[PDB]
Amino acid sequence: ADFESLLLSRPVLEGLRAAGFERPSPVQLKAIPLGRCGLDLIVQAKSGTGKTCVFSTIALDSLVLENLSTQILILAPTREIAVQIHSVITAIGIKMEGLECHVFIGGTPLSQDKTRLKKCHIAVGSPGRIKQLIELDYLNPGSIRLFILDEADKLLEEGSFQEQINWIYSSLPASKQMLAVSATYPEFLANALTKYMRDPTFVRL
Ligand SMILES: Nc1ncnc2c1ncn2[C@@H]1O[C@H](COP(=O)(O)OP(=O)(O)NP(=O)(O)O)[C@@H](O)[C@H]1O
Numbered sequence: 001a002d003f004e005s006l007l008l009s010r011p012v013l014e015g016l017r018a019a020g021f022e023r024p025s026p027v028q029l030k031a032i033p034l035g036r037c038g039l040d041l042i043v044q045a046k047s048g049t050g051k052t053c054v055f056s057t058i059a060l061d062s063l064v065l066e067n068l069s070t071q072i073l074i075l076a077p078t079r080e081i082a083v084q085i086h087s088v089i090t091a092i093g094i095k096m097e098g099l100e101c102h103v104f105i106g107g108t109p110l111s112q113d114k115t116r117l118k119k120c121h122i123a124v125g126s127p128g129r130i131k132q133l134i135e136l137d138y139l140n141p142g143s144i145r146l147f148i149l150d151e152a153d154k155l156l157e158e159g160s161f162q163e164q165i166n167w168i169y170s171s172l173p174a175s176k177q178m179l180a181v182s183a184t185y186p187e188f189l190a191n192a193l194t195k196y197m198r199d200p201t202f203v204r205l
Contacts, residue, residue, distance in 0.1 A: 025049060104116075141168075
């Protein structure tokens, strides 16, 4: 009923408290332990349920802070959502000295992203920019063990980023954990996630 019963690391517990997160929401209670367990998760719950906190907490708890390598990749369907994610992670991560979380979106020179990726624990970005950075080997995906799709319905809908995500998924290490979080779970999304998750655990309220 508090974040302690979820067995999170002390830095994450202290960060949550500092950032105003006093008690977990119903979806946070359910999803966080299962995330810590290393399972592939599909978290489907309506807006207002606390889903960004869910994957942000799982992500920060999983990080090897002393290893300055990109261990976590998070994709978002819009520039604004990518930054929203960065804000939550950097708030919850406030007691983790030297945490490096960076946003990769269009409009910044690729040379600048290359430099930033030299010191980056958690990469958050849009699928097109992330694919370009992996193709250039500016983001070497060799240490990524956690791959998160935020607003997965928006990412994988018709006219969106399925082709780019398929490519990125394939570039990553075979051994990794996947999280997909979404307000809805239509057939197109159920279908698309079969490419990435062999037997996912579902989390709903
Ligand atoms: N358990 C909680 N306790 C207090 N505040 C929370 C909690 N969960 C989320 N919040 C607040 O909401 C912000 C955004 O996180 P969150 O609610 O997880 O994402 P969101 O983008 O609103 N997605 P969702 O809530 O699922 O629609 C945080 O920065 C907090 O200010």
